[PDB]
Amino acid sequence: TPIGFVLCFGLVLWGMASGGSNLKVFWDVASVFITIGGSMAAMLITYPMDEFKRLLIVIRQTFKDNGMSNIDVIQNFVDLSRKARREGLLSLEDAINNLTDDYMKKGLRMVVDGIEPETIREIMELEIDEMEKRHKSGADMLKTWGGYAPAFGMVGTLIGLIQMLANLTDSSTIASGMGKALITTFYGSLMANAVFNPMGANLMFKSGVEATTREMVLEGVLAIQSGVNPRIMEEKLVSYLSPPERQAYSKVQ
Amino acid sequence: LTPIGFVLCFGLVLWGMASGGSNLKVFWDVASVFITIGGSMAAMLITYPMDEFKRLLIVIRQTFKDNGMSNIDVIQNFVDLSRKARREGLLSLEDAINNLTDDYMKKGLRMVVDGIEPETIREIMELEIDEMEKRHKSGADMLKTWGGYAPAFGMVGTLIGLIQMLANLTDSSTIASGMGKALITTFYGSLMANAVFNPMGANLMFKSGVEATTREMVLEGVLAIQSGVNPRIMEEKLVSYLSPPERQAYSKV
Amino acid sequence: KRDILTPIGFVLCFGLVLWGMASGGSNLKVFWDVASVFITIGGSMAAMLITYPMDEFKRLLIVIRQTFKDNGMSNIDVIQNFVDLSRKARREGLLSLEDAINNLTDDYMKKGLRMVVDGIEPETIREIMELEIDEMEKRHKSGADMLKTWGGYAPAFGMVGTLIGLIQMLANLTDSSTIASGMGKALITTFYGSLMANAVFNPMGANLMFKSGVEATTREMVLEGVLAIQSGVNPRIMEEKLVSYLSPPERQAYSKV
Amino acid sequence: KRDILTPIGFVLCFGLVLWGMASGGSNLKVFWDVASVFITIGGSMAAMLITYPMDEFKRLLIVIRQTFKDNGMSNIDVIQNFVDLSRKARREGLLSLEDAINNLTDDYMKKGLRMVVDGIEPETIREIMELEIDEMEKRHKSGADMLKTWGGYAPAFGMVGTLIGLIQMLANLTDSSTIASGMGKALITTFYGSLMANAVFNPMGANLMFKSGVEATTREMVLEGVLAIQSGVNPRIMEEKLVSYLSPPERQAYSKV
Amino acid sequence: LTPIGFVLCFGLVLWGMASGGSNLKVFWDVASVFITIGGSMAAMLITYPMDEFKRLLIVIRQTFKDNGMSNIDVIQNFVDLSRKARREGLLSLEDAINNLTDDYMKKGLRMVVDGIEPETIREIMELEIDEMEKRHKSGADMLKTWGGYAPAFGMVGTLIGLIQMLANLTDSSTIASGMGKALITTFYGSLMANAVFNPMGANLMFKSGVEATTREMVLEGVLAIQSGVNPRIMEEKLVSYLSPPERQAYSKV
Amino acid sequence: VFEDIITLDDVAIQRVLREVETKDLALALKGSSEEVANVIFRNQSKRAASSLKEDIEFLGPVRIMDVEKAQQGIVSIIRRLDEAGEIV
Amino acid sequence: VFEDIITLDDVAIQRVLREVETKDLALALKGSSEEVANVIFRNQSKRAASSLKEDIEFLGPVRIMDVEKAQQGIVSIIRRLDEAGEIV
Amino acid sequence: VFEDIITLDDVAIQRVLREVETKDLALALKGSSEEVANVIFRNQSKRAASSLKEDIEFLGPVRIMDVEKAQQGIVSIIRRLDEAGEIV
Amino acid sequence: GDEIRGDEWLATFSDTITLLLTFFILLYSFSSVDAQKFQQVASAMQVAMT
Amino acid sequence: GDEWLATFSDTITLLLTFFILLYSFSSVDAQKFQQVASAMQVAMT
Secondary structure (H helix, E strand, O other): OOHHHHHHHHHHHHHHHHOOOOHHHHOOHHHHHHHHHHHHHHHHHHOOHHHHHHHHHHHHHHHHOOOOOHHHHHHHHHHHHHHHHHOOHHHOHHHHHOOOOOOOHHHHHHHHOOOOHHHHHHHHHHHHHHHHHHHHHHHHHHHHHHHHHHHHHHHHHHHHHHHHHHOOOOHHHHHHHHHHHOHHHHHHHHHHHHHHHHHHHHHHHHHHHHHHHHHHHHHHHHHHHOOOOHHHHHHHHHOOOOHHHHHHHHHHO | OHHHHHHHHHHHHHHHHOOOOOOHHHHOOHHHHHHHHHHHHHHHHHHOOOOHHHHHHHHHHHHHHOOOOOHHHHHHHHHHHHHHHHHHOHHHHHHHHHOOOOOOHHHHHHHHHOOOOHHHHHHHHHHHHHHHHHHHHHHHHHHHHHHHHHHHHHHHHHHHHHHHHHHOOOOHHHHHHHHHHHOHHHHHHHHHHHHHHHHHHHHHHHHHHHHHHHHHHHHHHHHHHHHOOOHHHHHHHHOOOOOHHHHHHHHOO | OOOOHHHHHHHHHHHHHHHHHOOOOOOHHHHOOHHHHHHHHHHHHHHHHHHOOHHHHHHHHHHHHHHOOOOOOOHHHHHHHHHHHHHHHHHHOHHHHHHHHHOOOOHHHHHHHHHHHHOOOHHHHHHHHHHHHHHHHHHHHHHHHHHHHHHHHHHHHHHHHHHHHHHHHHHOOOOOOHHHHHHHHHHHHHHHHHHHHHHHHHHHHHHHHHHHHHHHHHHHHHHHHHHHHHHOOOOOHHHHHHHHHOOHHHHOOOOOO | OOOOHHHHHHHHHHHHHHHHHOOOOOOHHHHOOHHHHHHHHHHHHHHHHHHOOHHHHHHHHHHHHHHOOOOOOOHHHHHHHHHHHHHHHHHHOOOOOOOOOOOOOOOOHHHHHHHHHHOOOHHHHHHHHHHHHHHHHHHHHHHHHHHHHHHHHHHHHHHHHHHHHHHHHHHOOOOHHHHHHHHHHHHHHHHHHHHHHHHHHHHHHHHHHHHHHHHHHHHHHHHHHHHHHHOOOOOOOHHHHHHHHOOHHHHHHHHOO | OOOHHHHHHHHHHHHHHOOOOOOHHHHOOHHHHHHHHHHHHHHHHHHOOHHHHHHHHHHHHHHOOOOOOOHHHHHHHHHHHHHHHHHOOOOOOOHHHHOOOOOOHHHHHHHHOOOOOHHHHHHHHHHHHHHHHHHHHHHHHHHHHHHHHHHHHHHHHHHHHHHHHHHOOOOOOOHHHHHHHHOHHHHHHHHHHHHHHHHHHHHHHHHHHHHHHHHHHHHHHHHHHHOOOOHHHHHHHHHOOOOHHHHHHHHOO | OHHHHOOOOHHHHHHHHOOOOHHHHHHHHOOOOHHHHHHHHHOOOHHHHHHHHHHHHOOOOOOHHHHHHHHHHHHHHHHHOOOOOOOO | OOOOOOOOOHHHHHHHHOOOOHHHHHHHHOOOOHHHHHHHOOOOOHHHHHHHHHHHHHHOOOOOHHHHHHHHHHHHHHHHOOOOOOOO | OOOOOOOOOHHHHHHHOOOOOHHHHHHOOOOOOHHHHHHHHOOOOHHHHHHHHHHHOOOOOOOOOOHHHHHHHHHHHHHHHOOOOOOO | OOOOOOOHHHHHHHHHHHHHHHHHHHHHHOEEEOHHHHHHHHHHHHHHHO | OOOOHHHHHHHHHHHHHHHHHHHHOEEEOOOHHHHHHHHHHHHHO
């Protein structure tokens, strides 16, 4: 949700407008090219085109791909463990296909197809690893851009200061050129702190949330194959829930 | 103590602020509050959707008021339970287990009373420890992330202040007081990071390690109850978790 | 096929900085002074000579230069070369590839293929070829770490220049020529240090590691292609196993043939 | 083990700082500021109370204090004590050692040897005594991490006092007394924060980690001496394995007895 | 490593200091050296025990001679030893072992001619490599720690100078000279960190990797001689340890 | 036989009950009377007994022979435990 | 069985006790005399004896036949090491 | 039966001259004539032939009847590939 | 081991203040301080520190 | 070993404290400025 972006730039824009100065003192078309274009050009040197495409994919996943609730994961696995206890293991095909969650039908499908549990863990732990690697790579790209933008804004500020010293004519315009040269640094810090750094941390946090759910699903899938009691399956999977989540789960199950 | 540390931290800083006879209103600026607090808050909404932010806020609040039993009292309960289990068996501990106030000692001991092999009891209990540590880390990481955002948006507000005043100046005296108003937002971000967010994030990390030691202590001793070890041997292994100040306090009790 | 992102980035990065430098119609000479060159560029380069001996520093420079001078045949062309070799292998024998192998340009490919022709055991070839990849990755990492070391030294010596400029300015604040000389030293040392770190050294080091990983993947596919010549497979099982290493953009790129 | 670098380092560190403060004709009262004490020393200590509850804060302070004590006896004496114990245990049996193992002041040798005399299996003894080493290292790491946490808090609150002082100074430019108070606050808060971090907290926490590792090694070889007493061996194979744990500059010292 | 980088580093920086017709005596202060070097050295004494300093002196002394064995030389003699181990048997490798000066080739080679299991040889030789890396890493950490202490105590001296000057201002014309004089300690700390301590710490880390590669190369050659590989087999196995500049130099000889 | 479990003491039954698998216990409880299950329900925890309640009910009509083989597993566990410390 | 232990010297009785474990020693000591326990709880550690003080009480009811085999087993181990350095 | 190498086609000799050791093959060629050596050198890689030449000039004096062990082993290699893709 | 440190702002702040100090030193180089106004401040700091 | 950069920005801010205070009690000489401005051009151009 872009609610954070609207609030971030809205409060910043309000802060500039809060002072009696017009907003034109913060606008500089040349400063945008030095900061945005300079840091973007360093990103082109830093990263190949393949990393940019993977970053764009992982960014779109954040705004669209929601996931599955951990309360639903335990609720489904507990019922699946219960049903696989009353009936046989080769009786959950109707339930397996009706699961509205990827990586869980696939994990359960190699359980009914009789592949070794250790190979199931390795196959589905690698899927966790590539998800983590994809998010970490995209997060590092955004964090790298979050370091480039203020660095190139500082370079643009230094250029403005050096130019001002060379053309030193009026002492009453020295401070005016001081603030005009600082626009590049303001652009760099604003883009780093309102766009790049929070979005990179967003990918890192979203990776950890997904990794916990995938490990919880993998734990349930392995417990279905090596048939455990529904009490043991629930007790094993409850550990992934926070204390607030356990009370919510206890009411339903 | 954390609740009194917050009172002491702002109280001691405020006393130093007012020590030289200066009025404290020079440190108050509504616009600076909204740029620093609001801007860092909005950046946190980019990193965390306002559903995981609430859950992480509750996670932080949960650790602030929880008051578990002491480590010394863990020894006494386990020694008493081991002595009683060697007289009337494991099923005699059922009434004593329900009188516990841990929900982690209770969960492990209830698996002990039922027929649950030590292999799955261990990995279930270590899973609870690992997921507890991950939950504390995510809450601490959220606080540490805010401890970086607040000075970051204090710096953004300082640039806004510096640019605004350097553009509209009337004398060298009004410029000097312009820097003071520009630096208020940086002061807000530094104070919020160093007095609230960073110490609270490190507090969660410290609490996670303390509870992890207690839970490893409880697990190593839940397995000793069902393994039928001697109460003296159980106590000898259990007391190798307490500080020497705690070891003598347990000796006299 | 062709890496065009980093030349575009270099042209855009230094073109935009140059455009900003000349934006006000000012002389570009104001951004040049030997004192700042001697402090930041000279100081950080001499600090690099403390970390890296000249023999090893020059050696890592060639590794960096060779990594960005990639003129070899593309991953598709290697696969099309292996199926061509596999076709002749099962028709005229393994010894018939001696002339074809010696005409190859990839030294890694020839090394594995020559062992296959001479009859070296399959697990010996894999062990040697894997060690070729592992040591080449380590060499590339040393070159990239060298650039990252310089990317920290240059801003560090640009802050030393700021201290030099400030002290020089403060000691003679009534000279007006020491002030100008000190003023330029402080600002331009920082200007040089941030340009070296953020426009050259740090982006180049990260760029080097990405090229190393791509080249390692190419070698891992060449190893399987080499080992499939030894076992002996028609260019139908070879083609399917080789393209599993191909990148998703490259997987269907050759699908027309 | 009669460490002299730490007492000497502290004397020179504060002696040089004090010599710098009393350089020329400066009166030492100018470095004392009550407002500064409240901001950085008080502020960082109060932030320490947020991170660490007062009960656990006291515990870690006790853990830090105990690690810097003279402890008991050196690595030379424990080998001599174990060899003397081996002679007495190999003649009068494992028992009759109660008097010898009760006047000791180790509290870790005593714990292991009491289990040996009682007749506890070596596997149980080894796992209990190795658990003591692991938990002691965790306690020492917690104390050292607490010192490093304070080493980051004090300069952080020293910078807070700088902003407080500058804001005070710039908001009361017509009042010289408020200007003087604000500037004195800003300068001395940083001075206090940098002294606490760089002269005390950061060096001392690292010093705790080195002492923890040395103590862990001492406990690792006390366990071997305890287990070898239980598995009765003559006092020549005991002194064979105990000296293996000695440091390279310590093994030859024992050879001269 | 020759000490020409130190002469270049201080010499090139000193040329920049004196460039704009600036007198160098404003950068010299004997008391400033004691505050910066002595203060950071006293902190290092607190930080590190005596044995760590002795170990640091050993690795630093080693890195300034480096009169060891070239990688091209290692393979050249290993390939020659392969031929003799094939032409005249393994037992004939007794005079050639004692006529070389490597102190690591000999230890591994003497193990080969003494009938020791390949896994046992790999255990001993790899542990020796890890010991060498640990010695270099701890030495580099010590120099990096000193590279953080020297600027820290240089700033302490600057603060002392600023506090003392401010207590006796009385002139309004000696402030700039006083501030410049106080800044000398910080300049000394930064110069010693960036020109001595940090580059030397990175030098030890780089030297560790170079020696680790040479020792891994020797271990591969030692195991190849034990198994009696073809001289062509060990050649191409050891050639995959040389840079392309080294491979063309080795083939031409 | 499995019908001799009633005469055993509560302490001896409790040990073997948490050793016998719930499926094995459920399989051997169909061939026994209701009074047999009472000595089994009491000598187990509430959670263990609750799992037994659903396991016996949701197992389905099983062959007579399958019940016979299950009782051997339970009746043989107490056979080796006779000298291990259990008093009969 | 288990009568000629008082005559056995104080040095050697400690040696045999290190072989027989707590479970075997306590099982044999139930069907013994008061002065044998005093003999046993005088060549043992002060706190090790207290461990066996409660163990013998904890067993409670037990088949009498377990006493002789433990006593014979304690008798058997003495004979099998009777040729060692300890006095016969 | 030896000396059948010179009778087979080049491809068959190339395959069988890809898994024999360069030492025993040299041991089986020192006593053979030049025509047998010729069919070996040209059905092998240049590096492999150079390795063989180095192994025949530094074999030393060896007794008879052990070469036939290498020759029979070399022939036995053809026998085991007679039931494979190779043909005679 | 991605440690979260809240020091990303520090680089921008350090460089911004550094050139602000360098720019303010330039203004003071060609400026004249009021002796009477400075004398008040100089004497007040002696009272405050001592 | 870079925790000291926090103190450096602290000290540079401390250095800037005096000059912002001095600048408030200052006026442009309008002649020393010409000397500094003229020498500014000579040093860089």
